[PDB]
Amino acid sequence: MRDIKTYLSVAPVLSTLWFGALAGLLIEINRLFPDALSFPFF
Amino acid sequence: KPPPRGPKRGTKVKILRRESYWYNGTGSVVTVDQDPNTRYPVVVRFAKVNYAGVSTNNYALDEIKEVA
Amino acid sequence: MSHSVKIYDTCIGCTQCVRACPTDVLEMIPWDGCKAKQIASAPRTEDCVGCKRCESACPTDFLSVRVYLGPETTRSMALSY
Amino acid sequence: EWFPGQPRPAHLDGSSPGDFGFDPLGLATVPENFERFKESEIYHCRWAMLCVPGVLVPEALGLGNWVKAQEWAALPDGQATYLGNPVPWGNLPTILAIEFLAIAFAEQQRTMEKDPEKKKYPGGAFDPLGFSKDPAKFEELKLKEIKNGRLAMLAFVGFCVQQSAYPGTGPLENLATHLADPWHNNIGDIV
Amino acid sequence: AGLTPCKESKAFAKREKQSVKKLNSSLKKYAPDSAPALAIQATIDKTKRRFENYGKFGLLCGSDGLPHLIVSGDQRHWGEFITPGVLFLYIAGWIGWVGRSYLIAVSGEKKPAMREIIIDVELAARIIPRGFIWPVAAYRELINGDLVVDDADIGY
Amino acid sequence: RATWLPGLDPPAYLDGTLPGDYGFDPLGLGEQPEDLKWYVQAELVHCRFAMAGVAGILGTDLIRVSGIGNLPVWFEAGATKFDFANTTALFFVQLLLMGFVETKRYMDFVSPGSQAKEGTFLGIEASLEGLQPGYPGGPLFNPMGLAKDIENANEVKLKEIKNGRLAMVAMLGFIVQASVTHAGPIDNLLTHLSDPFNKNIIHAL
Ligand code: CLA
Ligand SMILES: CC(/C=C/C=C(C)/C=C/[C@@]12O[C@]1(C)C[C@@H](O)CC2(C)C)=C\C=C\C=C(C)\C=C\C=C(C)\C=C\[C@@]12O[C@]1(C)C[C@@H](O)CC2(C)C
Ligand SMILES: CC1=C(/C=C/C(C)=C/C=C/C(C)=C\C=C\C=C(C)\C=C\C=C(C)\C=C\C2=C(C)CCCC2(C)C)C(C)(C)CCC1
Numbered sequence: 025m026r027d028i029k030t031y032l033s034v035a036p037v038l039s040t041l042w043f044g045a046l047a048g049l050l051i052e053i054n055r056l057f058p059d060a061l062s063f064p065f066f
Numbered sequence: 067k068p069p070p071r072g073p074k075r076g077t078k079v080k081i082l083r084r085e086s087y088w089y090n091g092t093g094s095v096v097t098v099d100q101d102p103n104t105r106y107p108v109v110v111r112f113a114k115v116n117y118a119g120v121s122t123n124n125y126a127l128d129e130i131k132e133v134a
Numbered sequence: 135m136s137h138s139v140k141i142y143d144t145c146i147g148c149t150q151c152v153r154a155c156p157t158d159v160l161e162m163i164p165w166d167g168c169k170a171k172q173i174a175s176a177p178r179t180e181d182c183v184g185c186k187r188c189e190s191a192c193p194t195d196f197l198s199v200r201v202y203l204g205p206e207t208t209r210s211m212a213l214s215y
Numbered sequence: 216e217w218f219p220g221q222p223r224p225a226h227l228d229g230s231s232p233g234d235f236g237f238d239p240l241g242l243a244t245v246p247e248n249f250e251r252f253k254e255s256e257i258y259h260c261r262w263a264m265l266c267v268p269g270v271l272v273p274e275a276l277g278l279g280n281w282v283k284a285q286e287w288a289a290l291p292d293g294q295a296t297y298l299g300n301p302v303p304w305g306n307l308p309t310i311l312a313i314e315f316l317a318i319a320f321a322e323q324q325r326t327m328e329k330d331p332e333k334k335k336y337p338g339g340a341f342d343p344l345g346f347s348k349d350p351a352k353f354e355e356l357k358l359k360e361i362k363n364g365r366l367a368m369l370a371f372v373g374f375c376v377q378q379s380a381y382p383g384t385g386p387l388e389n390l391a392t393h394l395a396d397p398w399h400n401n402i403g404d405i406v
Numbered sequence: 407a408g409l410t411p412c413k414e415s416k417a418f419a420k421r422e423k424q425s426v427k428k429l430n431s432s433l434k435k436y437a438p439d440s441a442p443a444l445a446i447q448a449t450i451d452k453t454k455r456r457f458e459n460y461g462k463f464g465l466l467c468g469s470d471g472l473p474h475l476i477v478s479g480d481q482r483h484w485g486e487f488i489t490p491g492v493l494f495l496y497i498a499g500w501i502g503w504v505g506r507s508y509l510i511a512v513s514g515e516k517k518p519a520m521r522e523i524i525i526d527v528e529l530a531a532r533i534i535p536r537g538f539i540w541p542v543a544a545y546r547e548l549i550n551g552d553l554v555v556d557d558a559d560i561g562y
Numbered sequence: 563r564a565t566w567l568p569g570l571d572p573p574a575y576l577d578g579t580l581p582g583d584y585g586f587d588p589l590g591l592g593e594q595p596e597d598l599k600w601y602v603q604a605e606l607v608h609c610r611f612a613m614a615g616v617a618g619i620l621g622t623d624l625i626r627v628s629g630i631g632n633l634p635v636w637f638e639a640g641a642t643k644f645d646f647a648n649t650t651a652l653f654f655v656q657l658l659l660m661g662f663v664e665t666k667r668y669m670d671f672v673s674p675g676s677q678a679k680e681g682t683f684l685g686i687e688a689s690l691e692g693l694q695p696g697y698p699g700g701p702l703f704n705p706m707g708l709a710k711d712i713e714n715a716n717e718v719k720l721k722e723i724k725n726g727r728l729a730m731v732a733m734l735g736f737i738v739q740a741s742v743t744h745a746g747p748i749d750n751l752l753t754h755l756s757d758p759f760n761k762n763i764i765h766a767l
């Protein structure tokens with residue numbers, strides 16, 4: 025069990041997990057606020 | 067009767083050789099040779115590695131500054 | 135003299151350069167300036183091809199055998215024809 | 216001290232008139248730089264104290280301000296007016312030549328003496344009464360001069376900046392402007 | 407600089423007209439209720455509300471009917487460059503400041519080599535929020551003089 | 563010790579002499595003395611401005627709505643005008659005296675007591691220090707000199723801390739509350755009190 029977690033902590037595996045989460049987040053935001061050329065809140 | 071010369075052991079030293087790979091760096095003294103004729107007595111071990119992979123070499127007394 | 139091979143006083147007498155000369159340039163002579171009590175020596179620089187492997191096996195601070203490439207002769211160019 | 220709570224920069228240990236611990240740029244590190252600065256300081260003080268009332272009092276009379284009193288030289292046929300009177304030598308090349316030779320020579324007479332103390336405090340023919348009699352009073356006499364002289368320089372800065380902010384104005388004209396409505400005429404309205 | 411507002415520029419309201427007509431051209435070939443007809447319609451509405459937002463948030467359009475950005479800092483236009491820009495700089499430090507903390511954190515170990523190819527996840531979890539306040543934390547380091555070193559560079 | 567997070571232990575440096583030491587500084591923002599020493603005043607000056615600040619926002623809108631008096635919204639107060647008040651000059655004026663009082667306080671922390679040995683008379687005694695950096699009570703700053711400087715400082719400052727800590731939060735409420743509701747703070751309270759389960763930030767969005 026410990027060895028599995030350690031392997032999951034090596035750099036490449038984190039990268040896909042981290043970037044994959046990042047890709048999902050940006051895609052969602054563009055799905056809800058599309059075209060987004062300016063920041064018209066303030 | 068004469069005491070050993072140079073640092074004793076473990077004492078961090080600041081390297082002063084200009085062409086070295088660890089100039090202005092710090093290593094650990096592992097042994098000093100007590101033969102007066104020996105031309106580079108202080109055997110310095112480091113933490114990094116030079117481009118050859120080596121991580122130790124001899125040094126001269128005046129190229130070693132004994133930080134504390 | 136075709137190429138110039140020079141050995142400094144840093145050398146620790148490890149006999150790693152001599153064993154790595156492919157054309158028998160360097161050789162070992164007695165000294166008194168090291169624990170090993172021997173320093174390398176280059177008395178046959180004519181046949182020195184210039185293959186820097188002689189000093190890719192000198193394990194010192196910078197280097198203790200150094201090779202400067204000068205003019206080229208028919209053996210320092212390793213011509214077989 | 217000027218800034219109660221900061222340590223004195225080591226090279227300002229009184230030992231001078233008008234010295235309150237103020238050298239943030241360390242301009243006076245070199246003693247030679249230190250002494251020459253005193254000269255320029257007292258001179259910049261000395262000239263300024265003369266110039267401020269000469270800028271104001273004419274405006275307090277019918278005469279034009281410190282800007283108008285230089286304007287005839289702009290036009291080629293300029294002739295001056297002192298107390299309104301057209302002085303004959305008021306043409307620009309005339310006064311300029313008179314100005315140049317007199318200013319340079321007397322100011323060169325300065326450049327050719329190195330006491331160096333007299334280069335700040337000559338006295339003598341410049342002290343026809345001899346206020347320097349009481350060294351205690353004379354030392355305080357420098358203080359009054361220094362602080363007043365520093366006061367003059369700022370007033371000079373106010374006069375000039377108010378001119379750039381308000382072209383073609385007078386300091387008393389500026390003063391009265393504020394004096395109408397101080398709360399709607401201020402340095403607030405520039406920016 | 408002569409850039410008329412997009413809500414006014416007839417060229418802007420021309421591009422909006424063509425791209426709608428171009429899509430409506432591709433639509434009068436499928437069934438009025440099949441899946442293609444809906445996806446086409448979805449993109450049509452997305453386009454019209456795209457153009458409206460560009461003619462609403464004060465984007466200035468040239469003679470190309472296209473928006474132009476004024477990055478000069480005229481604070482009538484702060485949400486074009488300056489506001490998104492500050493938003494980036496906040497994030498960029500957060501990435502920068504966190505990573506610095508970790509390398510320092512694992513620096514004092516037997517071999518920092520192993521703790522970087524095999525990242526310590528728990529330690530990187532108690533450090534991941536410290537990047538919320540990086541502007542405050544760093545600016546104190548700069549004043550205290552621990553953000554930089556002076557002449558001890560290689561080795562230690 | 564009754565920290566903020568029951569299970570969690572308090573950090574080692576928040577020993578507890580500072581009033582309101584509820585072992586709370588998760589991000590490692592106070593693990594250096596000179597850091598922590600300069601941070602305490604910030605909370606003290608912020609909270610005090612945030613104690614009066616909410617009341618000025620609060621009380622003014624309370625009296626206006628009920629009808630006793632009339633004043634603009636604190637949101638709308640910035641553009642107000644009666645006479646002889648160019649917002650230009652006021653900014654300069656307020657910057658001046660505040661600049662004067664803020665600095666002399668700054669010099670006190672930078673150099674304790676190096677603020678009440680000078681020439682200017684008649685006042686050179688009180689502005690020494692309260693003997694506690696963030697509490698400069700003197701016989702002018704505490705004209706009802708009503709402190710013993712040690713005992714209640716544990717038990718009364720702890721009131722002024724937990725008072726301020728609340729007040730700083732409250733002001734943050736109005737800024738966001740006015741940012742979304744477009745209305746007055748009590749208006750936000752009055753609206754929510756009307757139909758609480760329908761007047762909520764979920765509906766405000
Ligand atoms: C913690 C990460 C970190 C930090 C704080 C810095 C900081 C710096 N780098 Mg840099 N660098 C890094 C990682 C980092 N580097 C990595 C991984 C690479 C290899 C691609 C580089 C390659 C690089 C080059 C080539 C240059 C710098 C330069 C600089 C300096 C100017 C900033 C700049 O230009 O950014 C440069 C930014 C990049 C090149 C983008 C890549 C950085 C990645 C995206 C960040 C990685 C963060 C890390 C993986 C996250 C760890 C999280 C942890 C919890 C596990 C500054 C001292 C420049 C310099 O010398 O200026 C003085 C310069 O020329 N760096
Ligand atoms: C000063 C302040 C407000 C002052 C208000 C004033 C003067 C109001 C003035 C006015 O209304 C009047 C009077 C009249 C109006 O006509 C004019 C205006 C101007 C409108 C609020 C502070 C408000 C400040 C707040 C809310 C600060 C919150 C900070 C938090 C939560 C930080 C927490 C942490 O830092 C710790 C504690 C430990 C870390 O380890 C973890 C983290 C989380 C990082
Ligand atoms: C305003 C503006 C502008 C301009 C700008 C500019 C001009 C700027 C400059 C700038 C500059 C001139 C800068 C400089 C700098 C320097 C330095 C020196 C820096 C440094 C930094 C640092 C050092 C950092 C660090 C860090 C941190 C803190 C975070 C992350 C991590 C690290 C560690 C990296 C424009 C027009 C564009 C537009 C409008 C706006």
Ligand code: SF4
Binds near residue numbers: 154155156158184
């Ligand atoms: S270059 Fe080659 S031939 Fe020459 S000394 Fe080195 S190893 Fe020998």
Ligand code: SF4
Binds near residue numbers: 144148150151198
């Ligand atoms: S390799 Fe270097 S150290 Fe070794 S014997 Fe040769 S010259 Fe000497």
